[PDB]
Scaffold this active site. Structure first.
Site, short mmCIF file in Angstrom:
data_model
loop_
_atom_site.label_atom_id
_atom_site.label_comp_id
_atom_site.label_asym_id
_atom_site.label_seq_id
_atom_site.Cartn_x
_atom_site.Cartn_y
_atom_site.Cartn_z
N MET A 125 4.29 -2.73 3.35
CA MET A 125 4.64 -3.80 2.45
C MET A 125 4.16 -5.10 3.06
O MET A 125 4.44 -5.40 4.20
CB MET A 125 6.15 -3.89 2.24
N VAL A 126 3.47 -5.88 2.25
CA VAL A 126 2.81 -7.08 2.70
C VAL A 126 3.39 -8.29 2.01
O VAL A 126 3.57 -8.31 0.79
CB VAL A 126 1.31 -6.98 2.42
N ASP A 168 -12.11 5.02 4.70
CA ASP A 168 -11.28 4.75 3.53
C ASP A 168 -11.61 3.44 2.81
O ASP A 168 -10.74 2.76 2.30
CB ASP A 168 -9.80 4.79 3.92
N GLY A 188 0.83 -1.18 0.00
CA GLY A 188 0.00 0.00 0.00
C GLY A 188 0.87 1.24 0.00
O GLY A 188 2.06 1.16 -0.34
N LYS A 236 2.26 -7.48 7.39
CA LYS A 236 2.43 -6.13 6.88
C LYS A 236 3.49 -5.39 7.68
O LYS A 236 3.34 -5.23 8.88
CB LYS A 236 1.12 -5.33 6.91
N1 LIG Z 1 -4.26 -10.13 5.49
C1 LIG Z 1 -3.97 -9.95 4.12
N2 LIG Z 1 -4.00 -11.00 3.28
C2 LIG Z 1 -3.74 -10.83 1.98
N3 LIG Z 1 -3.44 -9.63 1.45
C3 LIG Z 1 -3.41 -8.57 2.26
C4 LIG Z 1 -3.67 -8.68 3.63
N4 LIG Z 1 -3.54 -7.45 4.19
C5 LIG Z 1 -3.22 -6.59 3.21
N5 LIG Z 1 -3.15 -7.25 2.04
C6 LIG Z 1 -2.80 -6.69 0.71
O1 LIG Z 1 -1.86 -5.65 0.92
C7 LIG Z 1 -2.37 -4.46 0.38
C8 LIG Z 1 -2.06 -3.34 1.28
O2 LIG Z 1 -2.56 -3.47 2.62
P1 LIG Z 1 -3.09 -2.24 3.45
O3 LIG Z 1 -3.46 -2.70 4.83
O4 LIG Z 1 -4.23 -1.56 2.70
O5 LIG Z 1 -1.80 -1.31 3.51
P2 LIG Z 1 -1.44 0.23 3.82
O6 LIG Z 1 -0.18 0.57 2.98
O7 LIG Z 1 -1.34 0.33 5.38
N6 LIG Z 1 -2.84 1.22 3.47
P3 LIG Z 1 -3.30 1.56 1.90
O8 LIG Z 1 -2.38 2.48 1.11
O9 LIG Z 1 -4.72 2.22 2.18
O10 LIG Z 1 -3.53 0.23 1.08
C9 LIG Z 1 -3.83 -4.70 0.26
O11 LIG Z 1 -4.45 -3.87 -0.70
C10 LIG Z 1 -3.91 -6.11 -0.05
O12 LIG Z 1 -3.67 -6.40 -1.40
#
Ligand SMILES: Nc1ncnc2c1ncn2[C@@H]1O[C@H](COP(=O)(O)OP(=O)(O)NP(=O)(O)O)[C@@H](O)[C@H]1O
EC number: 2.7.11.24
Lengths: 350, 17
Positions: free
Chosen positions: A30-31, A141, A26, A46
């Site tokens: 990084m996930v 969001d 995101g 994450k």
């Molecule tokens: N538990 C999960 N299992 C599989 N994929 C996940 C999981 N959590 C997050 N993801 C993937 O990782 C991406 C980013 O996670 P996210 O929690 O939205 O991150 P962020 O950088 O904190 N916020 P954002 O910029 O709004 O996406 C998501 O859009 C999903 O594709």
């Protein structure tokens, strides 16, 4: 040999979690997937690195505190959290969650959903939102990328970094100018106002998501808030003065009121192949006036969702969510302390 | 990803009863 690196950066999550594989990123995290050597299953992790930015600290604290408290079938949980043993050493936080297979953003690139799939995904989104709203929390969001999905059609809402307790008098500028990956799911009032937000902002977002499931295109894209508002006006038609009285800044309101008149486009002209019941509900979610949008309970009772309607199995929170103190004005150092405290329960040997 | 029919999902199955 040693701590594994993914796409350039270390994921210091071993020895418990190993064999990492990149999933995605995101704007903040990084996930990766990882093998949990304790429970012998793959999990999602994450990594965020928030501590040099007050707003990133807010996101991290909010998401952790809320997701640890919430428990619902259609909301992602947190199973573990990894961070350094002392506050001085802590630069990263790793949030461990059930591994979901994809998200709606990724899936909509690859395929057009049947009405049966749309209906069940929408049901789950609203069922999860009912729980969130019952805790007096606004997600703020919602978007396709934070609706996690499996092959079984199970859907879980994630990404609670912008979630806040509903407070119509709370005036938080910052939100309007802070970077996010997409603004296309935001209600018109939150593109312009810094206060007065209500639960209806989330219903707007769900409407945008429904529209996009129907057509595989974003309904209200745009390069910035003025472009987006022109897209909204071009479909919904020109707002009435009372519709626009919800906009606080008088020059913004006068600007909107002075734009060329637009007629409403009937939904079945934009979506000629969509289920008429789906469009009826869509129509009731996407209203410019926030007070006139359907709320989550009545939405669950809409005929489109009738096969899934059951108020005996749509759990709500036990109590409103509460932050101990207002996070907005806390220095990043204080937020770091609160993050350290909230994550202490997961330290080895706690 | 190939989605299964929603009717195979656990929550859907609860609703079908
Ligand atoms: N538990 C999960 N299992 C599989 N994929 C996940 C999981 N959590 C997050 N993801 C993937 O990782 C991406 C980013 O996670 P996210 O929690 O939205 O991150 P962020 O950088 O904190 N916020 P954002 O910029 O709004 O996406 C998501 O859009 C999903 O594709």
């Amino acid at each position: 040999a040693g701590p594994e690196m993914v796409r350039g950066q270390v994921f210091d999550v071993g020895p418990r979690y190993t064999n990492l594989s990149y999933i995605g990123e995101g704007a903040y995290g990084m996930v990766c997937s990882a093998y949990d050597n304790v429970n012998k299953v793959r999990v999602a992790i994450k990594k965020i690195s928030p501590f040099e930015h007050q707003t990133y600290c807010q996101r991290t604290l909010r998401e952790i505190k809320i997701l640890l408290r919430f428990r619902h079938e259609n909301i992602i949980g947190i199973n573990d959290i990894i961070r350094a043993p002392t506050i001085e050493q802590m630069k990263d936080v790793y949030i461990v969650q059930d591994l979901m297979e994809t998200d709606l953003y990724k899936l909509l690139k690859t395929q057009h959903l049947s009405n049966d799939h749309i209906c069940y995904f929408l049901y789950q989104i609203l069922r999860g939102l009912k729980y969130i709203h019952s805790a007096n929390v606004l997600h703020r969001d919602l978007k396709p990328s934070n609706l996690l999905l499996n092959t079984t059609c199970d859907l879980k809402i994630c990404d609670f970094g912008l979630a806040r307790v509903a407070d119509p008098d709370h005036d938080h500028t910052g939100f309007l100018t802070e970077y996010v990956a997409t603004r296309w799911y935001r209600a018109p009032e939150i593109m312009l106002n810094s206060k007065g937000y209500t639960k209806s902002i989330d219903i707007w977002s769900v409407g945008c998501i429904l529209a996009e499931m129907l057509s595989n295109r974003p309904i209200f894209p745009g390069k910035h808030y003025l472009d987006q508002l022109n897209h909204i006006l071009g479909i919904l038609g020109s707002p009435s003065q009372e519709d626009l009285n919800c906009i606080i800044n008088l020059k913004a309101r006068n600007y909107l009121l002075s734009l060329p008149h637009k007629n409403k486009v009937p939904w079945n002209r934009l979506f000629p192949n969509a289920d008429s019941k789906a469009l009826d509900l869509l129509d009731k979610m996407l209203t410019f006036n926030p007070h006139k949008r359907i709320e989550v309970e009545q939405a669950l009772a809409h005929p489109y969702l009738e096969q899934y309607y059951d108020p005996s199995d749509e759990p709500i929170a036990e109590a409103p969510f509460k932050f101990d103190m207002e996070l907005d004005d806390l220095p990043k150092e204080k937020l770091k302390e609160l993050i350290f405290e909230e994550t202490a329960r997961f330290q080895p040997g706690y | 990803m190939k989605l299964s029919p929603p009717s195979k999902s656990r929550l859907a199955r609860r609703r079908a009863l």
